[PDB]
From Swiss-Prot:
Region: Fusion peptide, residue numbers: 1-21
Lineage, highest ranks first: Viruses, Riboviria, Pararnavirae, Artverviricota, Revtraviricetes
Protein name: Envelope glycoprotein gp95
Residues of the full protein shown: 58 to 85 of 246
Family classification: Belongs to the Alpharetroviruses envelope glycoprotein family.
Organism of this sequence: Rous sarcoma virus subgroup A (strain Schmidt-Ruppin) (RSV-SR-A)
Length: 28
């Protein structure tokens, strides 16, 4: 559940934290 979605709201902000921070390792 919401936790899991929360999870994934942690996370998938955490995702948004993959994508944005690698971007950065791409251009570099």
């Amino acid at each position: 559940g919401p936790t899991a979605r929360i999870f994934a709201s942690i996370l998938a902000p955490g995702v948004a934290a993959a994508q944005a921070l690698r971007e950065i390792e791409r251009l570099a």
